[PDB]
Structure formats: C-alpha cells, structure tokens
Ligand binder design. Structure first.
Ligand SMILES: Nc1ncnc2c1ncn2[C@@H]1O[C@H](COP(=O)(O)OP(=O)(O)OP(=O)(O)O)[C@@H](O)[C@H]1O
Ligand SMILES: Nc1ncnc2c1ncn2[C@@H]1O[C@H](COP(=O)(O)OP(=O)(O)OP(=O)(O)O)[C@@H](O)[C@H]1O
Ligand SMILES: O=c1[nH]cc(F)c(=O)[nH]1
Ligand SMILES: [Mg+2]
Ligand SMILES: [Mg+2]
Length: 1218
C-alpha cells in the first residue's frame, strides 16, 4: 500500500491532484480497508509516542529537580512549537491578503466613477488592479486548504501521541490505582476527551490573528470613511457579550429540559420492557395519558429553546445590516457625502471583520479552554502511581527455585488485619504443590502475591524465570481463537495438535463455524465460561513455562472434561515443572504431592494426602463456613397555506436584504449625478431605515415561524407514531428487540426535535443568500448568464462525484474507531494475566496497529474533504474573476455603485457557498431519522378496542368456557402450536394444566387474551369471543403472570391506575394481603414512590400485589401462571392458601410446572404440543396406568406419587361423596 504523498510535486500537492485514482475507485465501487492508503512513516503512532515519552520524561525530571508540579502543557508546547510556528506565518500572510483585498476593490471602483471613454492608461491600471485582485482571491481560495490540512494533521499527530501515551500508562498502573479509578472512566476519557485535540488545533492560530485583524481593519476604515468606524466597531463588539448571554441561557434551558427528556426515556423503556403485562392489564390508556402529559411538558421547554435558537440565528443574519446602517447613518449625519467607493469598501470590511470576530474568536477561545481542561484531566490520570519494577527483565542465572519466608503483605496499608500472615514455603520443579482453604481466605491473594503484584511488607520472596499464570475469572481478548491460544508466540503445528488433543477442545472446534479461527468479540459473547477457562488453560500449557499458577480453573466445568484435563495435562506432563494449584474440588487432592491448609491468612498444616488423612481433619467440613419523506414531513407540520406563506416571507426577507445595498447604490448614483443644491437627506435616510427595520423584522418572523412549524411537525409525528405503536400486535415487539425499538424513541425523535429545525433553517437561509447574490450578479450584467449553466452543471456533477465516495469513508472511520476502545477494555480487564507474562510489547504493538488504522481513516477523511473544498473554492473564485472582468469589459455602459454592489457580493460569495453545500450534505445525511420515524408511523393495528356490539355489563354471569377446534398460531406461515382443542369449562370450577414445558401452556392464555388472532370458535357464556372488544374482554378476565412486575410510581397508581376504588377498600384488601404492616412504615402512607420493578421488594411481595389487584378487580374468571418458581416455601404456602380461600366462587385456570399445587384440582387439561389427550378428574386419570398424567406422576418417584395419589383420592371422595 504505497503512499502517493511520497511522490507528489508541490503543484500537485496544493491542488490535491493525487486523490484522483481513489475517487475513481470510489465512484466505480464501494470502499474497504483493502482500498485504504497507508500513512506516512512519520505519522506512525510508535514514533510520536517515543518522542512524547522522551519530552514528558525530560520535563518531569526537570520538575523533580526544581521541586514543583509538572506540566503536560509545557511538554506539548516544547514539543510542537518549532514545527507549528511556520503555519502561523502562512496564516498571517493569508490574512494580510484577506484584509488587503477591499482596498483593491476601492481602487477599481475609484477607476469606475471617474470614467473617461477615450482614455487608455486608466483602463490599463484598472486591468492591473483586477488581475492583482485575481491573485488575492486565488491565494485566499487555493493555498488556504493546504494550510488547513497541515493544521489538522498536526492536531491528528498530537491526538495519536496522547492516545499512545495514555494506553502505555494504563497498561502499567498499580492495584491501588485500579481500585481508586475504574475501567469505565479510563476508556471514557480516551473515547471522548482526547478528541478535543482534533478541534482545538483548527482555530488555535486565530488567537493571535483576531485582534491584529481587527486593528488593521479599524485602521483602514479610520483612513477611509472617518469617525463612523468607531460606531461600527462598537456595534459589532457589543454582539459578543450578547452571544455569550444567549449561549448561557440556552445551556441553562437545555439542562432544565434534560430531566424531562430522561424521565420520558426511562418510562417509555419501562413500558416497552413490560409490554406483555401492560397489554394484559389494559392500563395502556393510563400509560398513554402519562406519556402525553410528559411529552407536553417537554415540548413547552423545547419550544422555548427553539425560539431562542431562532432569535439568535436571525440576529446573526441581521447583524451586518444593522452595523452598516448605524455606520452610514453616522456618516451622513456628520455632514459628509456618499460616493460609490467608500460605501462598498466599508461593507466588505465589515463583512470580513464580523465573520472573523464572531465565527472564529469565541469558538477558538472555548475550544482552547476545553483542550486545557482535557490536558488537565489527562495529566491527572498520568501522574498516577506505577508498579515498582522487579528484577529488571532477566539478570538471574535461571535459579529454578521458588521460596517465600516470613511473608506478610497488605492489600491496603490502612487495614488492621493483614490478608496473609507469615507465609513460609518453598517449591522445586517436579513438585505438585497445592493449597486448600475456605473461600475468600486469600488463596487467590497468595497466588497474586507470588505473581509479585502484592507489595511484600515483611519477609522475602524469591521466584525466578518467566511465569505462566491463569486468573480465576476467564479472560480472552477479542480476535481469532487461534491468536488467543498462540498469545503472539510463533506457531508450531505439532505443539498445537498436542495442546488441542490434551485440552479436549475439538468439541469446541467442531461446534464453532470457523473452528480454530473463530472470531470472538468483547467479554466472550460468542462462547461460554467453561470454554473460556479451557482456552485459558490451553494458552497456559502452550506457553510451556516452568512455574504454573492456577486459580480455580476446574470450578465452572463438568466432571469428564475436568478429569481428562487434570490427568492428561498434569499427571503425565506437569510432574517435571513447578506447579502451584488451588482447587475447591477435593477429589484431585489424592494425586497432589503437597497440600497446604490456609485460613485467616495463616498456614494450618502442610503435608501429603495420607498425612492429612491420618490427621483426621475433614476438608469438606473446612470448606463450609427521497422526496416523499420531505413531503410527508412538511405536511405533518401544517396545511400548505402556511408553507406558501413561509416561502413568501423567505423571499421578502431576502429581497429586502438585497434592496438595502441596492438603495445604497442608488443613493451613490444620484449623489454622483449632481452639480449649491443639496440632496434631500430625509427621504433617503428614512427609506434606508425602513429597509433595515424591514430586514430585521422579517428575519425574526421568518426564523420564529420556521422553528414553530418544524417543532409542531415533530410533535405531531411523535404523537401519531406513539399512538400507532401502542396498538401494535405483540408479534412486532417479539420480532424487534428492545434496543432497536428504543433507539428510534431516544435518538431519532431527539434529532427531529433539536437538530433538524435549526439545520434546515440555516441551510435554507444560506441558500437564499447565495441565490440572492447570484441574482444580483446576473442582474447587474445580463451576459453572465451564459457561463452560469456550465458552472451549475459542473457543480452538480462534482457534488454527486464527491458524495458517492465521502459516505464510504465517513462510515469506514466510524467502524474502525471501535476496535481500539475494545482492545483497551479487554487488555485492561486481563491486566493481571498480561503482566504475569513478561510480554507486553506485543500488546503495545497491536495497539499501535489499531491506532495506525484509525489514523489512516482520519487521514483519508481529511484529504477528501480538502479536495472537495478546493474544488468549490476554485469554482467560486472563477465566478469572482469572471464578474470582475466582465464589469471592466462592459464598463462603458455601467455605473460605479451598481458595479461595486455586484463585485462586493461576488466577493462575499466566498465561504457562504461552502457553508451552504456543507449544510445541504448534513441535512440530506441526517434526514434518515425522520425516515425511520415515518416508517414507524404506520405499523399494523390490532382489532379496535371498542366494537359496535357492546357486551352486557353483567356478563359473565357464570363463566362457561367453550373450546371448539381451537388452533393457535404465533405468526402467519408458522407452526401450528395448538391443534383442535375441544372442551367445556363449567361455572365455579378449578382446572389444572399438566404435561411439560413443550406443550404450549401459555398458548392457551395468549389465545384467550388474543395476543394474536387465533383460529377456531371459542364461546364464553354463549358469546363468541371474536365479537367482544379487547378492552371489553381483557378487563373482565384476570391473570397473575409469569414474573410479577410492579411499575414505577406510587402504590395507588401501580394497583388501581384507573382509580375506581376507595382508600378503605385499598387498605382492607392490602390487609388480607398481610403486607399492610409491611407498607405502613414508608415515608409516605400510601404515596411512596417505588424503585424499578420493585427492586426494594421481593418476588413474593410482587405476587401478593398481583393477587391484590386480582381480588380488587374481582372478575369471575382468573388465570394463574406458575405462581411458584424459586420463591420461599413460606410465601408459597401463603399464596396458595390465599388463592384457595379467597376464590371459592371464582373460576380459575391454573398452569404450573409442579403437580402438588394442582393435585387437588377438580379437572385438568392434558396437553401435549397443543393436542388435548385426556380430560377427567386427576384421580380417575391416574387410575389408568396407561394415562400420560400417571406417567408424569411416576416420573418424579414413588413416595411423592403416593402422596399425590392420596391427596387426589381424598379430594375425590370428599367432593363426589360428601
Ligand atoms: N483487589 C483486591 N483488593 C483487596 N483484596 C482483594 C483484592 N483481590 C482479592 N482480594 C482478597 O482476596 C480474597 C478474595 O478471593 P477469593 O474470593 O477468590 O478467594 P481466595 O481465598 O483468595 O482464593 P480462591 O480464589 O482460590 O478460592 C479476599 O481475602 C479479598 O480481600
Ligand atoms: N415468542 C415466541 N415466538 C415464537 N415461538 C415461540 C415463542 N415463545 C415460545 N414459542 C414456541 O411456542 C411453543 C410453546 O411456547 P411456550 O414457551 O409458551 O410453551 P411451554 O414451554 O409449554 O409453556 P410456558 O411458556 O408456560 O413454559 C414452543 O415450540 C416454543 O418454542
Ligand atoms: O463562511 C462561513 N465559514 C464558517 C462558518 F461556520 C459559517 O457559517 N460560514
Ligand atoms: Mg481467591
Ligand atoms: Mg413455554
């Protein structure tokens, strides 16, 4: 991958010519890492990191010498100033040209108003001034982009060096430092804060260019016009504190609305998660009411924020007109006269100085402040303590011995109890030493202390040679499994075969698709704990070390793999090297050569297994303690009348803005065509003031109207799509994951609320300004129309060409920015294992490779943007030059003011055109959010909540249930879960459900509740179920679900959301719940707000609340879903006794995984994969030995079978023969 920047002439380099092959490839097909362009060797991360290491270490040596604090800022400056000053020189000369251009404009105009048809020397001077103006425009619009690239490349180099520094420091930090900090912040700053370096460098050079430019412009204007320069500069400067005040107010309002935004996101996540339960309880009306209220409360604040944003933007639009109006009002009232030169000189100078002062200086100052904060945080992290080096790399002469004497170490020095006390043990190669103790006694602490990560407070420790160690928690860095096993060591086929046959990993190889080359992501999401432990053991054994340390490696695996691993990896292999192992399994201690008992940090007994057996101490005892999107989006706002009014207001404001300078030109022309008689100042000043105030008012009104319409459209879209999704069937929510359905609630709507209105308004404003300037340029000289068509077609083709390649780069960089973060996270998580081996330069090298790839993506992203910018500026400069030369060529018929207006607007098209193009690209890129929202607008709807045929309020009188050829089906074109159910359910009877967790169980509940449209005929009290509205059906059929889930809020709403009960009834029912005393201790008597899903409550309390809601809704027909899964037997017997003592007159359908709760049931469905097999009394069912219910009973055993038979028979005799 050669870098063409190596072979690039300066003429080609300035024009960015070398990117032509890459852009041709991007047009032909897509982009990928293969098409990537390798970075310059100087741009590599390793060299920058080495330089920054040298400089930072030098300054910290200086700081230690001088007895003072260090300075990352000082190090960075002393590293980069010598190579950053030349770009400052270049920006100085560029700004000199930028400020000298209007003087040449004034000279050319000065030629115009003194026209002489027969003169030639004046025309030659005019051409000379025009061509030096061409030089000025070309140098402003050509070399500026190369300077910008070099500035941003210096910033990128700085960011890369800082990242390499922070990773290198993180990989070599101490245990106390890790305890103080966390893996979250340490990746958070590297992901967010360091990115300020790629933005601060861009505006940095304007700190020393702003005031100098302002002073130069002020001096020029003081020379040109007179006293009005002070007034103009004062008005322009007063804008800045106003900008700061609006920024502060907007930030405060955004912080105020953030809490409402977070509350809405949290509650909508909650309803999405608990959507099956909320659908089965028919509280979606209350939830929709709450969401609507919160949405209105949020929309008020965001409407205020949008209004403030629009006011700020309109004030920006009218600032230049206000400044020039004040300046010229002072100019005329002082007693001076108006010509056609000074007018446009002042206008252009104001444009330039206003742009610099308002758009660059404050952004530069705030980015510098943010970068200083970033450097302060980075140095705060960097000055953290470091692990003391041990025995350098390897000076020892092998010394294959391990010894520990009088060892007492502290995990923390502040604690009073040493973790381990007075360790004394030595081990030799070929010894199978082991340690056994209670969980948490410090065996892992002993292992780590041997690893050297624990500072020896007392005694001596001597371990020599490279060490292989396995952590208790499995760790695998993301990548190919072969790479994880190899650890970076060279590949040996026979060794890999021996390891793979010894570790019994062939099963994992054949299970995984790629086998040995399978890709594993973060935290081993593609594998299991046992597989990860086996992988770690395989890596350790392949390392082929001398001292082996294992921390409970066989705990999270089965017996066969554990015995195979232990035997055929130690008993015939590790009997020659140093082996220290800790196990919670006592079976393997027979083969252990040495065994130690450790508890309370002190040794108890060390010896052989037979010696411990003779001692009589029990180890076990010790172990136990497009366009249509635009059309719909704009229609959702308001009717087209408001749209045409808005476009008319846009046109009126733009025409007034142009007419202000046109009136200046007309005033200059009329003054020139004179002669004493004096022009009536009142008329012209009044018309000028009227035009200026019209511009300001129309801009304000336009911005407010645009924001109002867009915000109203967003609100209407959100309401419509939420109302649509709330009525969506459960199939949509089963198919779409929770994260996917919440993404368009938390992100797309957010963008539609706070970014699309402003961005669209800014784009339309810039487009109107550009089209107005071009219209002026055409109107002044009608002949400029001819080149305009080729210019436009060339621009359109260029935009398409650049956009067909920019998207690929912008997505490739985003994709490539994640692996560095993943690598940092995984390496930090496995830091103990990483430092156990001497190998860390390899980890540094892979980090360097990932950083190089990310920097390569950044480099291409920079170069493509610079190429597009230079092409656009070339076109704009061509326009400027053609306007100027046409004006000079046809000067015999024009006049000074008209020419000046034309050429000044041609001058100011610079930057405006670029901003318009960039904002158009951003808008067409980000429209995808409302595309997703409108896609969510029209999900399919279920049956209407209320039918025309309203059921009688008294139904059900009895509760007879009829199943007639009932077939349930999860989705169309899917398996038939239920097959022709035919049964009758009488009034006030108890029905059980048997079988297995493969018969459907919940399928019947889904059919009755109609989560999905079923097939067949079901009659409830001689009424066909399909003819009852969903709210008129589910409201009168209660259920206690799989997992009870309480909802965020108070108990009052969380029990009776629709509020048809009384406080006395609430307290009474809660008293029979027996949680009344449990709840009458909270800060609120009954209004205490609960945590998420009752985190402070127990599952039994959840079940009690559910049965409370059931008894309060007191419908005849109820269903219970596996009331006990892992609940304590006390709360179990409570819930069964309540359910059997409160529902004597209520029909109940019971489903459960255990027969004891349903052995007393009068009747039972026998279900098998949706097929009804038997239906009779349970004792009659078990009377037949061939019955499947009897087989299920006999599966458990005999004594429980006998008890169930006794209970069923006594129920049968008591009921049938009273
Ligand atoms: N980062 C740490 N800071 C303080 N103490 C620690 C740290 N890591 C481990 N420990 C100590 O290690 C013990 C917890 O280890 P663990 O529960 O894994 O059992 P163990 O007795 O060390 O050995 P084994 O893992 O073999 O069962 C506690 O004594 C705890 O204080
Ligand atoms: N969300 C789902 N989408 C599609 N099929 C499903 C879904 N949930 C379950 N199934 C399938 O439907 C059948 C029965 O579903 P279910 O899991 O309710 O049965 P069960 O185990 O007998 O009951 P329970 O869920 O009460 O334990 C099985 O084949 C199961 O794989
Ligand atoms: O010409 C411009 N340059 C930079 C900007 F941010 C902007 O709005 N306009
Ligand atoms: Mg431990
Ligand atoms: Mg199931």
């Amino acid at each position: 991958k050669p870098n063409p920047l190596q072979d690039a002439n300066l003429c080609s380099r300035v024009f960015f010519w070398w990117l032509n092959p890459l852009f041709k490839i991007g047009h032909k097909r897509r982009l990928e890492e293969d098409d990537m362009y390798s970075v310059l060797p100087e741009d590599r991360s390793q060299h920058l990191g080495e330089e920054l290491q040298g400089f930072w270490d030098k300054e910290v040596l200086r700081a230690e010498n001088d007895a003072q604090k260090p300075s990352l800022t000082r190090a960075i400056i002393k590293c980069y100033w010598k190579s950053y000053l030349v770009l400052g020189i270049f920006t100085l000369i560029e700004e000199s040209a930028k400020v000298i251009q209007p003087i040449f404009l004034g000279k050319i105009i000065n030629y115009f108003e003194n026209y002489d048809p027969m003169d030639s020397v004046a025309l030659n001077t005019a051409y000379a001034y025009a061509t030096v103006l061409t030089f000025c425009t070309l140098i402003l619009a050509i070399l500026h982009h190369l300077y910008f690239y070099h500035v941003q490349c210096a910033g990128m180099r700085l960011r890369v060096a800082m990242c390499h520094m922070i990773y290198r420091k993180a990989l070599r930090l101490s245990n106390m430092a890790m305890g103080k900090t966390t893996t979250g912040q340490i990746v958070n700053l590297l992901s967010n804060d360091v990115n300020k370096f790629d933005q601060v460098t861009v505006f940095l050079h304007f700190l020393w260019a702003g005031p100098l430019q302002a002073i130069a412009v002020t001096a020029l204007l003081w020379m040109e016009i007179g006293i009005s320069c002070l007034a103009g500069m004062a008005v322009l400067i007063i804008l800045l504190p106003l900008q700061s005040c609006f920024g502060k107010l907007f930030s405060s309002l955004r912080s105020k609305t953030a809490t409402f935004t977070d509350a809405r996101i949290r509650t909508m996540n909650e309803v999405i998660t608990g959507i099956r339960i909320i659908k089965m309880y028919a509280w979606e009306k209350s939830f929709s009411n709450l969401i609507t209220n919160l949405r209105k409360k949020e929309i008020s604040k965001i409407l205020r924020s949008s209004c403030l944003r629009g006011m700020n933007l309109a004030s920006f639009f009218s600032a230049s007109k206000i400044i020039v109006f004040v300046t010229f009002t002072t100019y005329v009232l002082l007693g001076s006269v108006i010509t056609a030169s000074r007018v446009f000189v002042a206008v252009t100078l104001y444009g330039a100085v206003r742009l610099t002062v308002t758009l660059f200086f404050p952004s530069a100052i705030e980015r510098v402040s943010e970068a200083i904060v970033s450097i302060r945080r980075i140095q705060t992290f960097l000055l953290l303590d470091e692990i003391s080096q041990r025995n350098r790399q390897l000076p020892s002469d092998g010394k294959k011995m391990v010894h520990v004497q009088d060892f007492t170490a502290f995990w923390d020095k502040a604690s009073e109890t040493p973790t381990l006390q007075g360790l004394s043990f030595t081990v030799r190669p070929g010894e199978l030493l082991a340690v056994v103790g209670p969980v948490g006694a410090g065996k892992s602490s002993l292992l780590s202390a041997v690893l050297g990560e624990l500072a020896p407070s007392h005694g001596l420790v001597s371990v020599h040679g490279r060490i292989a160690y396995v952590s208790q928690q499995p760790w695998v860095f993301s990548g190919t499994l072969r790479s994880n096993i190899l650890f970076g060591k060279k590949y040996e086929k026979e060794r890999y075969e021996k390891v793979i046959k010894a570790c019994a990993l062939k099963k994992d190889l054949q299970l995984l698709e790629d086998g040995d080359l399978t890709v594993i992501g973060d935290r081993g999401t593609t594998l299991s704990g046992g597989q990860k432990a086996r992988v770690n053991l395989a890596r350790a054994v392949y390392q082929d070390a001398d001292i082996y340390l294992l921390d409970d490696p066989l705990s999270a695996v089965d017996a066969e793999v554990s015995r195979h691993l232990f035997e055929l990896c130690i008993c015939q292999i590790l009997h020659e090297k140093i082996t220290i192992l800790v196990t919670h399994q006592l079976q393997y201690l027979k083969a252990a050569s040495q065994i130690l008992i450790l508890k309370d940090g002190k040794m108890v007994q060390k010896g052989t297994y037979t010696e411990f057996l003779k001692s009589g101490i029990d180890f076990g005892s010790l172990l136990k303690k497009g366009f249509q999107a635009y059309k719909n989006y704009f229609r959702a706002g308001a009717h087209w009348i408001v749209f045409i009014f808005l476009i008319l207001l846009n046109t009126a404001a733009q025409v007034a803005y142009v007419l202000q300078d046109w009136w200046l030109s007309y005033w200059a022309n009329k003054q020139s065509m004179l002669n004493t008689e004096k022009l009536d100042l009142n008329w012209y000043l009044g018309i000028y003031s009227g035009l200026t105030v019209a511009t300001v008012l129309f801009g304000i009104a336009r911005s407010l109207l645009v924001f109002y319409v867009l915000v109203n459209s967003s609100q209407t879209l959100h309401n419509k799509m939420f109302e649509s999704i709330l009525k969506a069937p459960v199939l949509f929510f089963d198919r779409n994951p929770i994260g996917r359905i919440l993404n368009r609630f938390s992100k797309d709507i957010g963008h539609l609320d706070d970014l699309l209105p402003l961005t669209f308004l800014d784009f339309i404003q810039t487009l109107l300004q550009v089209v107005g300037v071009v219209s002026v340029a055409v109107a002044v000289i009608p002949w400029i129309a001819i080149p305009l068509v080729p210019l436009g077609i060339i621009f359109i083709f260029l935009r398409r060409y650049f956009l067909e390649t920019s998207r690929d780069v912008k997505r490739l960089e985003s994709t490539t920015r994640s692996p560095v973060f993943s690598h940092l996270s995984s390496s930090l998580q496995g830091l103990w294992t990483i430092r156990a081996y001497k190998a860390e330069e390899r980890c540094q090298e892979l980090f360097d490779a990932h950083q190089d790839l990310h920097s390569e993506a950044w480099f291409l992203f920079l170069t493509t943007s610079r190429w597009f910018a230079v092409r656009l500026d070339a076109i704009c400069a061509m326009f400027v030059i053609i306007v100027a030369f046409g004006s000079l060529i046809l000067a015999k018929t024009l006049d000074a003011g008209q020419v000046g207006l034309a050429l000044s607007y041609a001058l100011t098209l610079m930057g405006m055109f670029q901003w318009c193009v960039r904002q158009s690209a951003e808008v067409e890129n980000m429209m995808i959010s409302v595309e997703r929202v409108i896609e969510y607008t029209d999900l399919e709807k279920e049956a209407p909540w209320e039918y025309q045929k309203r059921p009688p309020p008294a139904w059900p009188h009895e509760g007879v249930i009829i199943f007639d050829n009932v077939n349930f089906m999860y989705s169309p074109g899917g398996p038939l879960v239920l097959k022709h159910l035919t049964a009758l359910i009488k009034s006030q009877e108890k029905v059980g459900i048997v079988g297995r967790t493969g018969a459907g169980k919940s399928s019947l509940i889904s059919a009755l509740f109609r989560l999905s449209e079923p097939e067949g005929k079901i009659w409830i009290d001689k009424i066909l179920t399909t003819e009852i509205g969903l709210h008129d059906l589910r409201k009168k059929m209660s259920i206690i679900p799989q997992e009870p889930v309480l909802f965020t809020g108070t108990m009052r709403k969380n029990l009776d959301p629709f509020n048809e009960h009384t406080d006395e009834e609430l307290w009474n029912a809660l008293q029979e719940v027996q949680l009344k005393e449990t709840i009458e201790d909270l800060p609120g008597k009954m209004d205490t707000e609960l945590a998420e899903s009752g985190s402070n409550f127990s599952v039994g309390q959840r079940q009690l609340v559910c049965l409370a809601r059931a008894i309060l809704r007191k419908n005849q027909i109820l269903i219970i879903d596996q009331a006990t899964a892992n609940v304590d037997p006390r709360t179990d017997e409570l819930i069964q006794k309540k359910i059997r003592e409160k529902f004597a007159h209520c029909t109940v359908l019971t489903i459960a995984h255990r027969l004891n709760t349903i052995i007393d049931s009068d009747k039972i469905m026998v279900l098998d994969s949706g097929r009804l097999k038997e239906y009779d009394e349970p004792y009659v069912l078990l009377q037949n030995k061939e019955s499947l219910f009897y087989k299920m009973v006999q599966q458990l055993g005999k004594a429980e079978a006998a008890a169930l038979t006794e209970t069923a028979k006594q129920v049968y005799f008591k009921r049938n023969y009273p």
